[PDB]
Amino acid sequence: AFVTGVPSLKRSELETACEDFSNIIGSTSTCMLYKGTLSSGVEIAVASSLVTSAKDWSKENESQYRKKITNLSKVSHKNFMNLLGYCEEEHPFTRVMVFEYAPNGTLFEHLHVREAEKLDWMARLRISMGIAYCLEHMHQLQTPAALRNFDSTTVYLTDDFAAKVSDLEFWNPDMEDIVRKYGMVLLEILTGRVPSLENWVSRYFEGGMRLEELIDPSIGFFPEDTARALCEVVRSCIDRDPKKRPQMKEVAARMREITALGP
């Protein structure tokens, strides 16, 4: 065991759950993702290193592995994609982390890829609020390392479209940097726009854009003054000077106020 709290799986266990690793959700810089189901019926996303022998794997690699598990085992939040387990094995070489499975995939997909169906206003506020609570909690745990890769492709959506912020990448940022990224992700949620943006939105901030220009047209109707308040949160978060940015606890506080949604 490398940690208290998080169970250490036999590879035999995980082979069962993931049908001999036969079902792939995705693939990233540092890991392959396999779909599984535990004998408890709990759906899982298994993140496996891209290293297949002890040779391609350093003691630096190993040290990073155990640090990540340590750090993530300390993070537990309803709006985080929580670590459920891990599996280290030498025969054959296995370095795995087991995460919660989010059936509605990424925020990015639901904002930009699905043409037929769009997230409504209230679902967008709920997602925005959830993200903010997650980041606030992480800043309280002093583990922003888990957020070095934060953007709409790393935020997942549950059955009921709650946000789960993820940290899937094997470990080979300021909280001020995370606050700005939160600003940009909130802006993306509001507008439906993604960096192929600051210049575009500066026109809104300059006073030369109506909210019906800024807000994602797929939304339909929306409360103007709510939208206004959310855009000020964006403006605060993305200030060019990191020192002028709100703390995440202040962001979460203001967001709670505007959305009227508790943690």
Ligand X SMILES: Cc1cc(Nc2cc(N3CCN(C)CC3)nc(/C=C/c3ccccc3)n2)n[nH]1
Q: Where on the chain is the footprint of ligand X (CB under 6 A)?
A: 25-28, 33, 45, 81, 99, 101-103, 105, 156, 166, 168
Minimal distance, residue 155 CB to ligand X, in Å: 11
- 155 or 258: CB nearest ligand X: 155
Minimal distance, residue 80 CB to ligand X, in Å: 11
Minimal distance, residue 33 CB to ligand X, in Å: 5
Residue nearest to ligand X (CB): 26
C-beta separation of 155 from 165 below 8 A: yes
Q: CA-CA distance, 217 to 126, in Å (whole number)? A: 19
- 27 or 52: CB nearest ligand X: 27
Minimal distance, residue 191 CB to ligand X, in Å: 23
- 82 or 226: CB nearest ligand X: 82
- 96 or 230: CB nearest ligand X: 96
Of 103, 115, 237, 118, which is closest to residue 189 (Cα–Cα)? Answer: 118
Minimal distance, residue 81 CB to ligand X, in Å: 6
- 156 or 204: CB nearest ligand X: 156
Minimal distance, residue 249 CB to ligand X, in Å: 27
- 110 or 139: CB nearest ligand X: 110
Minimal distance, residue 17 CB to ligand X, in Å: 14
209 in helix, strand or coil?
Answer: coil
- 127 or 238: CB nearest ligand X: 127
Over the chain, what HEC string results? Answer: CCCCCCCECCHHHHHHHCCCCCCEEEECCCEEEEEEECCCCCEEEEEEECCCCCCCCCHHHHHHHHHHHHHHHHCCCCCECCEEEEEEEECCEEEEEEEECCCCCEHHHHHHHCCCCCCCHHHHHHHHHHHHHHHHHHHHCCCHHHHCCCCCCCEEECCCCCEEECCCCCCCCCHHHHHHHHHHHHHHHHHCCCCCCHHHHHHHHHCCCCHHHHCCHHHCCCCHHHHHHHHHHHHHHCCCCHHHCCCHHHHHHHHHHHHCCCC
